[PDB]
């Protein structure tokens, strides 16, 4: 039931922003493919989630210490749940 924290970095057309007439607040800024797929994702499992920013505009690079950055560092570091984005396996 509860609220899978998202950190996000807008791609297109996977996360773009959502421009609307509509106010948008927080996840309303966003729109696009992985959006659909979380709610999809929120229907399946019944729980919920949490649309933020990402750390640094980044979508992540690692350092030669092993240190990332980005959404990778924001789910490395365990400060998000979920990372709504295009990221690489």
């Known amino acids: 039931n509860r ?3 998202v950190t ?3 791609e297109e057309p996977f996360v ?3 421009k609307s007439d ?3 607040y927080g996840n309303d800024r966003f729109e696009g493919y992985c959006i659909d797929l979380l709610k999809e994702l929120a229907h399946i499992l019944g729980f919920s989630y949490e649309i933020r920013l990402v ?3 980044k ?3 690692q350092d030669d210490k092993g ?3 980005g959404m990778v560092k924001e789910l490395i570091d365990h400060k998000a749940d ?3 984005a295009p990221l690489t396996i």
């Open 16 to 18: 773009m922003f959502r």
């Open 22 to 24: 509509r106010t948008l």
């Open 55 to 57: 750390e640094d505009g």
């Open 82 to 84: 979920l990372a709504v």
């Open 59 to 61: 979508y992540g690079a």
């Open 67 to 69: 240190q990332w950055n």
């Open 8 to 10: 996000t970095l807008l």
């Open 3 to 5: 609220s899978l924290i």
